Design a protein around this nucleic acid. Structure first.
Lengths: 253, 352, 255, 253
DNA sequence: TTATAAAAAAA
DNA sequence: TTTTTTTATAAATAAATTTAAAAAAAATATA
DNA sequence: TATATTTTTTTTAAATTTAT
């Protein structure tokens, strides 16, 4: 296994997105691409990371390798990689070391980094693609401010879906928070416009600590895809630029 | 010693109690009932039994306790004055005989507890019986003189002299655990002045003006209510507790109208009443003149205080030297004034 | 019945950022002349005399005099939800148990209609006489924040000395003595870096540093600090907002 | 003693470097410079300092005086000075007060600061001036990246010297790490990159808490001159531009 | 000088 | 159906000292 | 440079014996 990646900030933001949720997970690396479908340490939220092999630059993979990494530890290893460094993953068959090589853009620093992995139980949940009636395409900064600023009021948000727009409501000791968002149908910039596709209106209640942990992924993309339907887990999808996606799951409160 | 008045203020008007912290009274002159302090330090300061003494057999827990508490209040900016009780009044003698009977029966359980062999009951009933003497208050005033912190001697009641001190504006507030200072006429009453933390003991600041505003009363109305909750200076009704005293004071204003409307078949009226002289003594006690006494917190003496505290008491001289150094350090510091004496209140503002 | 549409909502955000840690529970005195506040510190040292006049508000109306009781930590925690360019609308109705804060971004689409539960607060209002202060020091706000923070690094008291040549900020502490001196900078023309001192009597007073560090969180409101003070008269730290009102901070001197 | 610095941010960065390494220091004020030799709180890392007299604006020294200064207090007092402040170090022969005078670049504010000086005069250990086998004159922020990003994974770096590149090898319990640099003597970039004067190989295990204390002098100099040999403490030069230099010493483990 | 849980008594 | 004596109970502390523990200002990192 | 964001200092409230 060898996966050279000329923009290491994507994998750095992935590991700053998942070190708060998941402590230990099995990286299901295959020939089609890097897949990570794992459930968090508190056993509430499910994270589906898919990094396609077409998005990688020099991707080769012999067999289906499933190594169990420590997310805080290799996140601390990816602290050593800069914003612009070229991350080259490297692995062997008989070895259990995830060899990480960081290369400078001006080719002056080579940072080799091995790992001491341990095995874990390979639990594949596999939530199927339920047809989501209300899909919402939000910007990253707006969803980050909505979750981070309704989280100060209560531990529960109430997301409401409509044709006119999405309504984020939150109650608690701090009065009543209630946020409208008018559906801008491609009139502004497409990275800023909110487009909603509604079949029936969806009114659900979700937690906000797990949604803060989900919206830590907002440096990865400029668009957040919220998919809602009745009594299903909530998809919080972060579409990485032609390099697969990153989907979160949350059961309603 | 008022039965359940703190529960009545905590149930009726919680806004009258301002639970503050020990460092918040950093500019207030504070009058302390010293007898509560001496009774607090002669009970709690123990090591599994006997009172913490010297090798001469002299009782000296109250001096070390007041030394620690008083220097910890100069550390938090309190300028205290200790008001000492003198000759007790004639109406005090009934509760004094009741307390003497309580100490006599505590002496009886101490007599049958030494033969039992249980060491916990021996120190427990040693805590139950404490009698202060002239010698304890004499060495207490000597330690206050050597610390440069003034003492006042009340003619009749130290709570009454504290309430006369607050009413004359010489000190900001009275410091006793009693509710007597509310009855004798102090507008602000402080409680629980120890040396502890924020979570452990807050300072129960009882404002009498907030009590009279919330209950709709005044000074002679609160005295009759405080009689009806069972003061030590008289005897209350057997059938009238706190809430019934609130309802009857809000029904009949003076206590003579309560006498004018009772039934002896339902409510047992205590014969041979003492309420008139108790009302005339809570309204008008005999006290010292507070305008004739100047309160000065002078510099603490050092060498006579260390030879007084260690030449006949056998104490840790480095702790006494550090305590006098902290008192002299915190005494000469610049105190912070308030805005209550610079700008005056033109009116309150409630919520709507 | 009380609708107070304010376009520059960063002013109210910076007011509650200034007022979140000095005083913890304040009663806003809403009249038809504008939103006012007059609340003391819990240790009775500092007084926050805040006014926001009706001329600077974009749409201000109130039928009667109102006084709501607001947890200011709660109002800072709900006003941190709004951004720096939100139009902030204050809405209160008849028998207002709650206050509605509407944050509408102009270029964006977020109609952030928050509500906040009020408090059962009874505080006192104090009449401030319009005194003629002897030494009035108009000087830059970030310079005042630098002086208060960098003398709170030394000790707990600043002995402010005022004269004709300039104002001197002396702070005696356990590390040493820090004498920050200033010069009269009306001869050199600057747009905001001007220490304008109008002195009548040379005053020499000592003030605390915890309360001055609580005062210097109002520095993003304006670049002007009007240090009005006199001998045995409390210090006035006035933050003159150019839009409406002025945030006046009062501080009792140390003896 | 009256040393006036036009660039007082140099002394600000010196005391921000030495505020946490050493606590109380003896400023051996010479007639031709400002000198300091002290060891740390655990007495394992030696700090040498030399501020030359020609970098100051006005410098007078009527007597060779050795002030004893707690550097936490003078670091807190130098935190009051701005980064553009003209700093005058007035002293007195009989009075033990260091009158730090910070002046603004505009003539509107001068801020006088005395401080209390204790007496701590100990036997300084003079290092012998010896030739060094591996002199690595490499940029400072690169060394800050080495110290922080290898203290994330371990507590020891084992630096290897070679002609083509210098290798910082950390082998902590979280995993292995080999950051190898490249030799460039101001070839590509505008300032001087990693220049190695290697004669004998260097294979020494070092410490990372003390290197993390060492790398707080990185706002002073753009480059770090790492000079070391076999079984000698290394020399971490922070050559300040026309004002003097700052050295650091740490024995191998 | 408090403060309790507990309990019969009583409005 | 709460209230009220009426019981026999319990109790009044503060520093020398760690020590685990929770904030609160420092010093990066980042949009 | 705000704006958070973790690290890490800084209290600080616990829980012990001594305060003879």
């Amino acid at each position: 296994f060898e996966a050279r990646l000329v923009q290491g900030s994507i994998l750095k933001k992935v590991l700053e997105a998942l070190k708060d949720l998941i402590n230990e997970a099995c990286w299901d690396i295959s020939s089609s691409g890097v897949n990570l479908q794992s459930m968090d340490s508190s056993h509430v939220s499910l994270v589906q990371l898919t990094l396609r092999s077409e998005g990688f630059d020099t991707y080769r993979c012999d067999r289906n390798l499933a190594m169990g990494v420590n997310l805080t530890s290799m996140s601390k290893i990816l602290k050593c990689a800069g914003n612009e460094d070229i991350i080259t993953l490297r692995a062997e068959d008989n070895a259990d070391t995830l060899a990480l090589v960081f290369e400078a853009p001006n080719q002056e620093k080579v940072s080799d980094y091995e790992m001491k992995l341990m095995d874990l139980d390979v639990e594949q949940l596999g939530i199927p693609e339920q047809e989501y009636s209300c899909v919402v395409k939000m910007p990253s900064g707006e969803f980050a401010r909505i979750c981070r600023d309704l989280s100060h009021i209560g531990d529960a948000v109430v997301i409401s879906c409509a044709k006119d727009g999405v309504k984020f409501s939150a109650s608690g000791e701090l009065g009543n928070g209630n946020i409208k968002l008018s559906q801008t149908s491609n009139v502004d910039k497409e990275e800023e416009a909110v487009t909603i596709e509604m079949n029936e209106p969806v009114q659900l209640t979700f937690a906000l600590r797990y949604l803060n942990f989900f919206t830590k992924a907002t440096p990865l993309s400029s668009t957040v895809t919220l998919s809602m339907s009745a009594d299903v887990p909530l998809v919080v999808e972060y579409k990485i630029a032609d390099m697969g996606h990153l989907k979160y799951y949350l059961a309603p409160k | 010693g008022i039965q359940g008045l703190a529960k009545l203020i905590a149930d009726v008007a919680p806004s009258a109690i301002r639970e503050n912290d020990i460092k918040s009274y950093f500019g207030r002159k504070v009058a302390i009932d010293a007898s509560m302090s001496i009774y607090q330090f002669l009970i709690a300061v123990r090591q599994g039994g006997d009172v913490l003494q010297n090798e001469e057999g002299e009782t000296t827990s109250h001096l070390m306790g007041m030394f620690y508490r008083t220097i910890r209040m100069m550390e938090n900016g309190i300028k205290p004055v200790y008001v000492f009780d003198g000759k007790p009044p004639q109406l005090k003698s009934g509760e004094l005989a009741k307390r003497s009977e309580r100490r006599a029966e505590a002496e009886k359980q101490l007599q049958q507890a030494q033969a039992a062999g249980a060491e916990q009951e021996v120190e427990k009933f040693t805590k139950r019986l404490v009698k202060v003497t002239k010698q304890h208050n004499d060495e207490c005033k000597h330690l206050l003189s050597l610390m440069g912190i003034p003492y006042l001697d009340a003619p009749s009641e130290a709570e009454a002299s504290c309430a006369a001190l607050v009413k004359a504006g010489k000190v900001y507030a009275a410091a006793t655990e009693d509710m007597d200072c509310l009855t004798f006429g102090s507008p602000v009453l402080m409680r629980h002045l120890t040396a502890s933390e924020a979570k452990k003991l807050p300072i129960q600041e009882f404002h009498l003006s907030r009590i009279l505003q919330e209950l709709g009363l005044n000074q002679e109305q609160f005295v009759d209510l405080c009689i009806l909750l069972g003061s030590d200076y008289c005897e209350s009704i057997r059938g009238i507790g706190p809430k019934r005293a609130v309802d009857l004071i809000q029904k009949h204003k003076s206590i003579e109208e309560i006498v004018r409307r009772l039934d002896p078949n339902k409510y047992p009226v205590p014969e041979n009443w003492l309420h008139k002289e108790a009302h005339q003594l809570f309204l008008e006690p005999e006290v010292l003149d507070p305008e004739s006494v100047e309160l000065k917190w002078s510099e603490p003496n050092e060498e006579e205080l260390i030879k007084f505290m260690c030449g006949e008491k056998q104490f840790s001289e480095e702790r006494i030297r550090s305590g006098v150094k902290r008192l002299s350090k915190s005494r000469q510091g610049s105190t912070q004034g308030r805005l209550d004496d610079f700008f005056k209140v033109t009116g309150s503002l409630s919520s709507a």
